[PDB]
Design a protein around this nucleic acid. Sequence first.
DNA 1: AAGCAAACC
DNA 2: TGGTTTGCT
Length: 224
Amino acid sequence: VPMHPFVKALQEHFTAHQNPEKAEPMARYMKNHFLFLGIQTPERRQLLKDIIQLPDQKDFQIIIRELWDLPEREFQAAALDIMQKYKKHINETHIPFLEELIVTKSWWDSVDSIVPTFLGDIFLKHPELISAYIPKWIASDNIWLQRAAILFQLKYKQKMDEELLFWIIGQLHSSKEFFIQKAIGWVLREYAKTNPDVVWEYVQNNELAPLSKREAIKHIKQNY
DNA sequence: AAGCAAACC
DNA sequence: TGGTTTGCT
């Protein structure tokens, strides 16, 4: 049961506007890993906006954590919306907190919302800290930390550390896991928008699961 | 923005 | 495999 007044209010307000009809397909979409209230993003953003109508920064981790502990998935989605409002106060001291969010209530919807934006931004400012986390994540056999290691650079474009990217991919290319094979294909395809020749050379000369290779070269294969 | 792509099956 | 739904940048 949440103790922070803001979370209490959000819980009451979301619950007051739940839609059981929508809840069922939303839950099915996430392979029924989570309960849903049945509130999609536009309404969920409006309901969050109602409650803002913003707690001191000292509270933001407590608020996020309490929301993460609530059963229905919309509360974790709201928590990420809230974390965005504290963007300027998030720094390298918060990486362990982000780790906790990644490995708790884990699924692609939360992890993909955490990793390329919040972790991506942190490691851009603190690239000398990557070696303290990325190898650990690779060795963890937690697929969501592994996906984090792959996707934190997803939006980097010209800022991509190519050698690092390819090393990470090499470490994880033999994973049987769909979410890892797919993340590899995704990040390669995305980076190929920036540096297509380098991605082509990588996939032509380094082993990848067929899913990963196909997804990587989806848009550039017609150029070679 | 709308061009894109995560899921889903 | 590739069409559908939803949401991000």
